[PDB]
Enzyme design. Structure first.
Site, PDB file in Angstrom:
ATOM      1  N   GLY A 172       0.793  -1.230   0.000  1.00 58.21           N
ATOM      2  CA  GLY A 172       0.000   0.000   0.000  1.00 58.21           C
ATOM      3  C   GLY A 172       0.823   1.276   0.000  1.00 58.21           C
ATOM      4  O   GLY A 172       2.053   1.236   0.067  1.00 58.21           O
ATOM      5  N   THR A 173       0.133   2.414  -0.071  1.00 56.18           N
ATOM      6  CA  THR A 173       0.786   3.725  -0.077  1.00 56.18           C
ATOM      7  C   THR A 173       1.287   4.076   1.321  1.00 56.18           C
ATOM      8  O   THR A 173       0.864   3.478   2.308  1.00 56.18           O
ATOM      9  CB  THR A 173      -0.161   4.846  -0.561  1.00 56.18           C
ATOM     10  OG1 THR A 173      -1.252   4.994   0.357  1.00 56.18           O
ATOM     11  CG2 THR A 173      -0.706   4.545  -1.954  1.00 56.18           C
ATOM     12  N   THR A 174       2.186   5.053   1.399  1.00 54.54           N
ATOM     13  CA  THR A 174       2.799   5.433   2.671  1.00 54.54           C
ATOM     14  C   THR A 174       1.862   6.317   3.499  1.00 54.54           C
ATOM     15  O   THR A 174       1.294   7.284   2.988  1.00 54.54           O
ATOM     16  CB  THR A 174       4.140   6.166   2.458  1.00 54.54           C
ATOM     17  OG1 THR A 174       4.960   5.414   1.553  1.00 54.54           O
ATOM     18  CG2 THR A 174       4.885   6.343   3.781  1.00 54.54           C
ATOM     19  N   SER A 176      -2.695   1.905   5.650  1.00 55.63           N
ATOM     20  CA  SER A 176      -2.091   1.487   4.391  1.00 55.63           C
ATOM     21  C   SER A 176      -2.423   0.024   4.130  1.00 55.63           C
ATOM     22  O   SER A 176      -2.420  -0.789   5.054  1.00 55.63           O
ATOM     23  CB  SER A 176      -0.576   1.667   4.449  1.00 55.63           C
ATOM     24  OG  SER A 176      -0.238   3.022   4.685  1.00 55.63           O
ATOM     25  N   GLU A 209       0.112   9.510   1.727  1.00 54.44           N
ATOM     26  CA  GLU A 209       0.397   9.631   0.301  1.00 54.44           C
ATOM     27  C   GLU A 209      -0.777   9.078  -0.508  1.00 54.44           C
ATOM     28  O   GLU A 209      -1.187   7.932  -0.306  1.00 54.44           O
ATOM     29  CB  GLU A 209       1.684   8.863  -0.035  1.00 54.44           C
ATOM     30  CG  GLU A 209       1.942   8.625  -1.518  1.00 54.44           C
ATOM     31  CD  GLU A 209       3.099   7.675  -1.771  1.00 54.44           C
ATOM     32  OE1 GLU A 209       3.835   7.891  -2.753  1.00 54.44           O
ATOM     33  OE2 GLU A 209       3.280   6.710  -0.997  1.00 54.44           O
TER      34      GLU A 209
END
Ligand SMILES: [Mg+2]
Lengths: 111, 240, 195, 243, 250, 241, 231, 235, 244
Positions: D29-31, D74, D46
């Site tokens: 996943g995204t940060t 995330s 993010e």
């Protein structure tokens, strides 16, 4: 002891012409000897060229009209936007009323 | 509750549990049904691997569902009792609500419906039973004979057989049964039914059961000696 | 409904039941048969609250007919009466009890004996030489106590029954429109068409 | 083998492989990050701009629980939403019975027990998210991070997602260089920088920055989104540091 | 969630074996030896207190348990399974008997109830069988003294004397030579101690051995006086000192 | 080989899922120790905070179950907190139903019974934890009762749990072989904590700072945990003799 | 492989294959386009027939006077999800006298789909949805995936060959967003967008399906000769 | 094993796809919609000559204005027919009118995907639902176990379907009379059937606005078969 | 999920057989032999206990013969624990019938009821079947003396003489050879013991390895008596018939 019913007064009148129909009602709303409102609409356009009024106990009256308007909406969803005819609306309202046969909507309905 | 889907489709579009239930029917003792002009006869095979049996009390192969309808079967014996009980309850329920006994077709349609239900309900296996249901509709003199199977399909038959070696006795019935002129009497109908079982049975002793159903709730099971007289007359004509 | 009577003689049981059906102000029917055949040699008459009477009787009939088919055997009058008692005893502590009183007349083919059972809506069972429900006993029992013999013929039983009905027709305020009479013996159940 | 085919099965190591596989979805996943400041907490995430057709500022990721708790996660976004829905039910029932808003440590355990319960049976799948959350209660500011196993601890700073290693290193510098503490406004600026720095692991597509905060002095202990001028100021500060 | 294991985990194999029951019996075989001997005026049940650590207080772990005032139980196999069975056995003695008849159940019927519970764990959905064999000793007015064995399958058998667990085969042979129908309770205790010594490796004393009897009524253990018909429990657990006294006359 | 996935018997009469749950118990790499004084029961546990981003005050494996009962856990924190919440609920319910405080040994039995159920019922997995309950019981006095994933439990004079339990166990065994009594003959709990720390230092061969340890103390009518500064005062006293 | 037997199983890389297989059903489905301006929102859908004797499968479903969607994938699953949206829109109106926000409708669809991805026995939904609507914050377009992921967009496309229409909308972004107060031109842009996904077949009178909702425009579906104007 | 509600890597439900194979093994059923009415025809396919063929019931009435033909595992159709009849009658009770053919079809198709671990498997039968209502006139629908239904001008299902559908492709036009449709169903059934077509092994039916749903007598169908034979010999 | 571990106890094989029923019958073939013989003046039930011990308390032991009511008894072959579950259910059914109709339950009705319970475990529920075969010995006033058997499939049949458990093939052949219709109880007692003596896997047939019972109208006048034989009484009848 709690009384779930009340009487909001009011009088309604429906007359069928040759190629028209009228549904009339007074706009006064009351309890006992007091006036609640001098203008509280009681006859409603329910769509599909149908007008309705449920006179008596206003809480039950509003509930019934609200549920019938809802029934018209779902009739359109379920049957390809078919127009609800006045005879079909009448039979439908019977079932709405008889559903509470043992705890009735305290109203006299006219469409 | 146990909900596991036991009856399911396979890549070739077959439901194996239903098809394997038919294999249980193939193993069961042979049952045959023949309708005459004014009667229906149900014949049943008794395997003689079991002697020292008490024939008075041993469960008989033909069961009365009502006073005017009977049911025989091929397949799992224990399974058949559940269908027979349900059919008997429904027969009384019908009399109670409709104020008229079941038609043979209605009773068949009910039993067949129960069988179908057990082919797409979770946690259950199909009945390993095929049935022959025979009788007369109330106030009607036209003979009725129906068949059901594990899948739940049913149909009417002029004559039919189920169970082991039923392929052979159906072969016999297909060449010996004339539709334009069915067995005109009880004698002729019983004779043709015993003849059909003699193609498969072995000894004509205590191996053949015969039940005759006539109109107006007239149902009787033939005894050993009565059947033995048919067995005797058939082979004496055969010696020619 | 109203009057139901029973008498057990030498070789049979006789049940007499009124023909009237009254809904308050009017007599709606004068030929009503207040009985159901439970099995070839067992008859049940009934009286009580409207609707519940026929509903209960037909429910019992269905159950006994189911037993008869399942076992290929007719239950004894004693066994049938016990089944009926339990159903009424169960019913009395239900949400809405069956308000039904019954008489069960049967001929036991094993013992070669007639048998009469009286059961009320509470599930109170008694075996009797003669019985009734409601006010019927108040008018008829003094006559039955006097004339009844255990060795009476069927014809003598009918004559004693006629005397009972005559006393009812004299002293009862309600017009019950006569009675339908049925006999239960070794040969089964038959109706006396002239009474 | 076969120990990894079913949830709640112990391997011969004493490991639940299905939970470890859920962590892989989180790492994909995204940060997202969290910073504990002097009188509150700051959350930042993010958001990858997959296409120009995405409406800017509309697909909001950070979620509020009650009025004093913020949550970011995330991994599988739907799993995170399911967890926050439960959290909202837990917070509502706590306040219903006890009147006071749910304390952050209390809230942490409610999420923890629920996530742990999804490691007890093979009829359910573990959560495919790591959740950073916290806020202000009667005892002050609290920051937590919760893993697929149900494991959670309190944090000074927290990070998860694809750029977690980069983010963690940046957070560790802040802890060392500020033993006395960080202000809420400083923490917003720093949060912007860290997400921009962590975006190097997701450098293919451009992104959108989203920040929220709860502070005793700056937001009256209520969770609010950083918007307009304060957001732009943080973006400018972040862009200046990467160049 | 929901328990979605509504199917049997114990099933017949092609050879007619019920695998899980056989495996449960194997667990019992690995368990520490326990035994029971019936005398004319009593019954004795005994086992070794195999302490897992010397820091552990083995007095807090009870292998021999009171089920009713006149019935006791010992086991071989999985301890935790035994403990929960003792809880269920104590309760079922009340719910299915004492609350109905106003008296404690006879030994054979309590055994029958415990057996039923163990049978159901062999057929019910989503469970394994209990990994224990029980020895249940007891007395009641009309049946006198009795001793029963209950296995993982739910099967139970009455014994004059028997042994279960680790060294049961050797112990049963030892009991066959010594048992007769004229034994007094003290003789049975003596034989029990002799039999148990063979299967014990290390220390053999009152602190490492657990032993209880079903014998005479103990009015001193009743806790009240005044009711003549109430004379006290027949179950009594022997003390560490009482065991050591009989080990000198060994 | 599905007998290894769920809690059914293997051909050897073993439950592999239970055995593997015992292995999960050492996943945290933490050792705990419990001892009894005259008036108290002390439990100590190693504290390791490997990340600088962690808030060290929230890292704990000792739980206050009730006013009188404390619990230290050996195993992963999710299962530890699962057991902690349940123990707290059970202790509170007991007091409500039966009108007196739940004893330490009774709570241990109850949690051991719950654990037994997970070894018999297939849909529930065992918890990968060992639970050491401590209190000063109003009837039995200082008490240590320990539960494991098999559903086994027993009372202890003293006990140790973790990867290096054997070293600590043998060290404790040797001390009680000398003294020939079932407890630490000391008046104050402070000195019983000092004994506990000293003997852990001896057994593990490692020195401890104030942040390397975690201490729980049970006295009559209350269980409490020590702060870092309370532990520091303990460490200073140990070093000064 | 060994991890695709049910929705309750992660793979070793943390993937959910049953969900990915459900996503594949959408890719087999017929193309449908969504786009909006600041005043209106439009759906365009290419309907698919079985053969020349058959009708063309309907793609667009009305949920309320101010909201509706188009489908791509398993049609019965779209009926279930659209029925749920109808109920939720209806609950909002009856209880709160409030038209359901399009964003909140997306949140509800996400949560309903999620429950089918974390439990045993069930299966994921096998359909993708494009929801358009006009509420108190103007025109909206949403894309729903049965993984649970719901996204608000200016424009998009789903189904077979949807990438061509999506690239066109990405180019035209600055133009079609400005088409305010002109319904016909916004539909033209949508018809031109869906044309970038056609091969071999072209847009006929019983092939094309268009829906529109806006400032003073209830959600209405156009089929038959009503779309000949745009062919 | 594997879930009953499992998707394949291609995005299709295994069980639904397998039930479609069972329907391919079923006896042929054909429907043709015209402006004068809709015709429904079936192959009876008796397994033996001793089986009384008039007891084979593969064409069924749902209401006066709606008929239905089946192909596949025909036992599975019984609960579907029961639901259809109940839905048709219930709507008349609630609304004092006939139910639309599409609405009836949709109600039947709602049952289809109600299977899992509800019924344990999909239905193994396909239905041709034909009828008339005031809004959309004469209609023919094809209801599948996938829950999908298509409207058709003409449609064939069962073992001879793709050969029959190709034939229906060429023969159907918007000006067909009812008589022309009857002969056309008979012609195509005769083409795909194993045994020689007669009044005992094939069955016709129709739905008109005036007379409603009617299953044809064997004597009536026999005449239409004789009329077919003569017109094919006419060129 | 859980499906993985389901054995599916209620499915057909490709040949149309019920796996678990067949395997349960295999289990029963290793159980001690039980024999029932019906005579004109009564019924005999004889059964062999499985390899016993000298320390087993025989006089208080029961593993084979069980009383269902005063008129009906059963011989067990298979899992004893499974049998006791069904036996208790049968005892309750008999009392339910007696309470309802005020008459003792006819033998077949009790047998059909237990057999239907067995059938259910083969068709639904996903549970293993009962590994038990029964021989029912009973009397009622409709059919008189009756012998039935039931097995894990839930199928039941009536018999003049029958065996269940181990060596039924050998036992049934011996019974078929010496059985006659006009036989009496004392003769049937001898036949049963002689058959067990020849079919047994033990070296010799002794009193401690047997359970024995008779149902006789040898009850003073118009009634029926059940006699569960004591260990000493089995020892005496073994001497009388000349086996020991
Ligand atoms: Mg478990």
């Amino acid at each position: 002891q709690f009384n779930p019913y009340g009487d909001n007064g009011g009088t309604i009148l429906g007359i069928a012409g040759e190629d028209f129909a009228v549904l009339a009602g007074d706009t006064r709303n009351i309890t006992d000897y007091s006036i609640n409102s001098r203008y509280e609409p009681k006859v409603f356009d329910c769509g599909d060229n149908i007008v309705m009024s449920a006179n008596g106990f206003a809480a039950d009256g509003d509930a019934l009209v609200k549920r019938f308007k809802n029934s018209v909406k779902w009739y359109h969803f379920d049957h390809n936007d078919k127009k609800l005819s006045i005879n079909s609306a009448a039979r439908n309202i019977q079932h709405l009323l008889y559903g509470k046969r043992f705890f009735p909507y305290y109203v006299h309905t006219i469409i | 509750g146990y909900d596991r889907a036991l009856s399911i489709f396979s890549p070739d579009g077959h439901i194996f549990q239903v098809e394997y239930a038919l294999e249980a029917v193939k193993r069961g003792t042979c049952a045959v049904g023949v309708k005459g002009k004014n009667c229906v006869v149900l014949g049943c095979e008794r395997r003689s691997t079991l002697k020292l049996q008490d024939t008075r009390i041993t469960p008989s192969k033909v069961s009365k569902i009502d006073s005017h309808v009977v049911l025989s079967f091929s397949g799992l014996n224990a399974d058949s009792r559940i269908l027979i009980e349900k059919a008997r309850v429904e027969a009384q329920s019908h009399r109670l609500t409709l104020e008229d006994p079941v038609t043979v077709e209605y009773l068949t349609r009910y039993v067949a419906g129960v069988q179908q239900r057990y082919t797409q309900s979770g946690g259950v296996r199909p009945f390993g039973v095929s049935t022959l249901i025979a009788g007369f509709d109330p106030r009607d003199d036209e003979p009725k004979l129906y068949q059901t199977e594990p899948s739940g399909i049913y149909s009417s038959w002029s004559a039919q057989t189920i169970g082991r070696n039923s392929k052979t006795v159906r072969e016999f019935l297909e060449k010996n049964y004339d539709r334009k002129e069915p067995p005109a009497t009880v004698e002729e109908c019983v004779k043709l039914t015993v003849r059909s079982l003699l193609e498969v049975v072995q000894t004509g002793a205590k191996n053949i059961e015969i039940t005759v159903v006539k109109p107006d709730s007239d149902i009787v099971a033939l005894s050993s000696e009565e059947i033995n007289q048919y067995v005797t007359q058939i082979e004496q004509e055969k010696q020619e | 409904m109203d009057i139901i009577l029973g008498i057990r003689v030498q070789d049979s049981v006789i049940l007499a039941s009124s023909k009237a059906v009254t809904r308050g102000i009017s007599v709606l029917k004068d030929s009503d048969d207040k009985t159901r055949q439970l099995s070839p040699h067992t008859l049940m008459s009934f009286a009580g609250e409207a609707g519940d009477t026929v509903q209960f009787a037909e429910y019992i009939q269905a159950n006994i007919q189911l037993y008869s088919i399942r076992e290929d055997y007719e239950l004894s009058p004693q066994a049938v009466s016990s089944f009926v008692r339990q159903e009424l005893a169960k019913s009395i502590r239900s949400r809405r009890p069956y308000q039904v009183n019954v008489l069960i007349g049967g001929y036991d083919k094993k013992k070669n004996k007639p048998e009469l059972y009286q059961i009320d809506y509470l599930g109170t069972k008694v075996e009797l030489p003669y019985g009734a429900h409601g006010y019927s006993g108040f008018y008829t029992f003094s006559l039955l106590d006097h004339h009844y013999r255990p060795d009476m013929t069927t014809e003598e039983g009918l004559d004693l029954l006629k005397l009972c009905v005559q006393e009812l027709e004299k002293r009862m305020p309600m017009d019950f429109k006569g009675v339908i009479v049925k006999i239960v013996d070794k040969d089964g159940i038959r109706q006396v068409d002239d009474f | 083998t076969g120990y990894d085919l079913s949830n709640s099965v112990f391997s011969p190591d004493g490991r639940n492989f299905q939970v470890e596989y859920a962590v892989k979805a989180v790492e994909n996943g995204t940060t997202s990050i969290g910073i504990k400041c002097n009188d509150g907490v700051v959350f930042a995430v993010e958001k990858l701009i997959t296409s120009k057709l995405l409406v800017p500022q509309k697909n909001v990721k950070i979620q509020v629980v009650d009025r004093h708790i913020g949550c970011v996660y995330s991994g599988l976004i739907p799993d995170g939403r399911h967890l926050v829905n439960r959290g909202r039910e837990e917070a509502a029932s706590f306040k219903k019975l006890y009147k006071t808003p749910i304390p952050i440590p209390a809230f942490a355990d409610r999420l923890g027990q629920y996530v742990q319960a999804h490691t007890l049976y093979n009829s359910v799948r573990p959560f495919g998210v790591s959740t950073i959350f916290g806020g202000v209660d009667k005892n002050g500011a609290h920051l937590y991070m919760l893993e697929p196993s149900g494991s959670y601890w309190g944090y000074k700073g927290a990070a998860t997602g694809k750029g977690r290693q980069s983010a963690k290193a940046e957070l560790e510098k802040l802890v060392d260089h500020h033993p006395e503490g960080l202000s809420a406004r400083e923490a917003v600026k720093q949060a912007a920088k860290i997400i921009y720095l962590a975006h190097e692991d997701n450098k293919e597509k451009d992104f959108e920055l989203e920040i929220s905060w709860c502070s005793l002095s700056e937001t009256n202990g209520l969770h609010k989104f950083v918007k307009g001028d304060l957001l732009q100021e943080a973006i400018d500060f972040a862009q200046k540091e990467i160049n | 969630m929901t328990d979605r294991y509504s199917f049997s985990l114990t099933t017949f194999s092609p050879s007619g074996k019920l695998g899980q029951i056989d495996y449960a019996l194997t667990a019992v075989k690995q368990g520490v030896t326990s035994l029971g001997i019936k005398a004319t005026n009593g019954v004795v049940i005994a086992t070794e207190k195999k302490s897992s650590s010397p820091l552990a207080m083995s007095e807090t772990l009870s292998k021999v348990s009171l089920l009713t005032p006149d019935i006791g139980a010992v086991y071989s196999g999985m301890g935790p399974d035994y403990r929960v069975l003792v809880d269920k056995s104590r309760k079922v003695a009340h719910t299915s008997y004492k609350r109905i008849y106003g008296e404690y159940p006879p030994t054979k019927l309590l055994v029958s109830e415990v057996a039923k519970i163990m049978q159901e764990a062999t057929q019910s959905g989503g469970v394994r069988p209990f990994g224990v064999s029980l020895l249940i000793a007891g007395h009641d007015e009309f049946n006198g003294f009795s001793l029963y064995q209950v296995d993982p399958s739910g099967s139970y058998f009455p014994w004059k004397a028997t042994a279960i667990g680790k060294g049961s085969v050797a112990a049963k042979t030892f009991l066959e030579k010594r048992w007769n129908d004229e034994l007094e309770l003290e003789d049975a205790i003596h034989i029990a101690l002799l039999t148990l010594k063979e299967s014990v490796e290390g220390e053999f004393n009152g602190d490492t051995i657990e032993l209880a009897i079903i014998g005479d009524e103990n009015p001193d253990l009743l806790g009240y006086t005044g009711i003549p018909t109430d004379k006290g429990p027949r179950f009594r657990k022997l003390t560490s000192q009482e065991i050591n006294d009989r080990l000198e006359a060994l | 080989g599905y007998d290894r996935h769920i809690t059914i018997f293997s051909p050897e009469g073993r439950l592999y899922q239970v055995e593997y749950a015992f292995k999960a118990t050492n996943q945290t790499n933490i050792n705990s120790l419990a001892v009894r004084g005259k008036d108290c029961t002390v439990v100590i546990s190693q504290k390791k905070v490997p990340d600088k981003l962690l808030d060290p005050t929230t890292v704990s494996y000792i739980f206050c179950i009730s006013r009188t009962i404390g619990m230290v856990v050996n195993g992963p924190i999710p299962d530890a907190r699962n057991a902690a919440l349940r123990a707290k609920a059970e202790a509170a319910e007991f007091r409500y139903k039966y009108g007196y405080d739940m004893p330490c040994d009774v709570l241990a039995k109850r949690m051991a019974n719950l654990s037994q159920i997970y070894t018999q019922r297939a849909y529930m997995r065992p918890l990968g934890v060992i639970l050491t309950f401590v209190s000063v019981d109003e009837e039995l006095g200082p008490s240590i009762y320990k539960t494991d994933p098999a559903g086994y439990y027993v009372g202890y004079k003293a006990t140790a749990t973790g990867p290096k339990q054997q070293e600590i166990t043998t060290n404790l065994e040797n001390h009680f072989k000398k003294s020939k009594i079932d407890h630490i003959n000391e008046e104050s709990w402070e000195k019983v904590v000092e004994f506990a720390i000293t003997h852990m230092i001896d057994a593990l061969g490692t020195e401890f700072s104030k942040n390397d340890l975690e201490v729980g103390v049970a006295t009559k009518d209350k269980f409490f945990t020590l702060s870092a500064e309370n532990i520091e005062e303990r460490l200073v006293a140990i070093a000064e003799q | 492989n060994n991890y695709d037997g049910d929705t309750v199983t992660f793979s070793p890389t943390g993937r959910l294959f049953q969900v990915e297989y459900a996503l594949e059903a959408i890719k087999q489905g017929s193309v449908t386009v969504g786009l909006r301006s600041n005043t209106h929102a439009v759906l365009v859908a290419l309907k698919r027939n079985a053969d020349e004797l058959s009708s063309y499968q309907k793609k667009i479903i009305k949920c309320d006077e101010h909201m509706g969607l188009s489908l791509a994938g398993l049609a019965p699953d779209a009926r279930v999800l659209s029925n749920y949206l109808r109920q939720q829109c209806n609950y909002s109106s009856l209880v709160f006298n409030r038209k359901l926000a399009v964003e909140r409708a997306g949140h509800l669809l996400c949560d309903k789909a999620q429950k089918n991805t974390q439990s045993y026995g069930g299966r994921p939904y096998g359909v993708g949805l494009l929801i358009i609507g006009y509420d108190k914050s103007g025109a909206h377009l949403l894309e729903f995936q049965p993984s649970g992921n719901v996204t608000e967009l200016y424009g998009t496309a789903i189904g077979a060959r949807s990438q061509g229409a999506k690239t066109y909308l990405e180019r035209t972004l600055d133009t079609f967003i400005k088409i305010d107060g002109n319904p016909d031109e916004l539909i033209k842009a949508g018809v031109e967008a869906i044309s970038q996904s056609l091969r071999d077949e072209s847009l006929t009178v019983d092939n094309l399906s268009i829906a529109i909702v806006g400032k003073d425009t209830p959600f209405t579906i156009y089929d038959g000769e009503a779309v000949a104007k745009y062919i | 094993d594997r879930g009953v509600s499992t998707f394949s890597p291609e995005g299709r439900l295994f069980q639904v796809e397998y039930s479609l194979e069972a329907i391919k093994l079923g006896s042929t059923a054909i429907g043709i919609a015209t402006k004068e009415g809709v015709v429904l025809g079936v192959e009876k396919r008796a397994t033996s000559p001793l089986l009384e063929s008039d007891s084979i019931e593969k064409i069924v009435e749902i209401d006066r204005h709606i008929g239905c033909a089946m192909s596949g595992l025909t036992a599975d159709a019984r609960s579907m027919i029961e639901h259809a009849r109940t839905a048709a009658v219930t709507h008349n009770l609630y609304y004092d009118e006939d139910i639309n053919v599409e609405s009836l079809t949709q109600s039947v198709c709602d049952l289809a995907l109600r299977f899992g671990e509800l019924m344990s498997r999909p239905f193994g039968v396909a239905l041709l639902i034909a009828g008339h209502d005031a809004d959309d006139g004469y209609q023919l629908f094809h209801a599948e176990p996938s829950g999908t239904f298509y409207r058709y001008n003409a449609k064939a299902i069962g073992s001879g379907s793709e050969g029959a559908q190709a034939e229906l492709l060429n023969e159907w036009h918007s000006s067909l009379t009812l008589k022309e449709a009857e002969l056309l169903v008979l012609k195509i059934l005769k083409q795909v059937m194993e045994e020689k077509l007669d009044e005992n092994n094939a069955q016709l039916s129709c739905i008109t606005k005036q007379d409603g749903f009617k299953i044809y007598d064997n004597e009536k169908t026999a005449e239409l078969i004789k009329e077919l034979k003569e017109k094919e010999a006419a060129e | 999920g859980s499906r993985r571990y389901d054995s599916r106890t209620t499915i057909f094989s490709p040949e149309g057989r019920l796996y678990q029923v067949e395997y349960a019958l295999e289990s029963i073939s290793h159980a001690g032999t039980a024999i029932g013989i019906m005579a004109s003046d009564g019924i005999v039930l004889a059964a062999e206990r499985k390899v016993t011990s000298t320390l087993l308390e025989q006089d208080t032991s029961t593993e084979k013969l069980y009383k269902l009511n005063d008129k009906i008894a059963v011989a067990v072959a298979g899992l004893t624990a499974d049998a006791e579950i069904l036996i208790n259910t049968a005892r309750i059914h008999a009392q339910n019938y007696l309470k309802t109709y005020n008459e003792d339950i006819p033998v077949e009705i009790l047998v059909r009821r237990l057999s239907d319970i067995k059938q259910g475990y083969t068709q639904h529920g996903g549970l293993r079947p009962f590994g038990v075969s029964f021989i029912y010995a009973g009397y009622d006033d409709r059919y008189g003396y009756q012998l039935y058997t039931s097995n894990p499939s839930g199928n039941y049949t009536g018999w003049k003489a029958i065996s269940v458990g181990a060596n039924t093939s050998a036992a049934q052949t011996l019974l078929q050879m010496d059985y006659k219709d006009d036989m009496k109880v004392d003769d049937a007692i001898e036949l049963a013991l002689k058959t067990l003596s020849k079919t047994t896997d033990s070296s010799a047939l002794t009193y401690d390895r047997l359970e024995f019972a008779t149902i006789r109208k040898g009850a003073n006048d118009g009634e029926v008596y059940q006699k569960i034989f004591k260990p000493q009484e089995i020892k005496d009848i073994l001497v009388k018939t000349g086996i020991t």
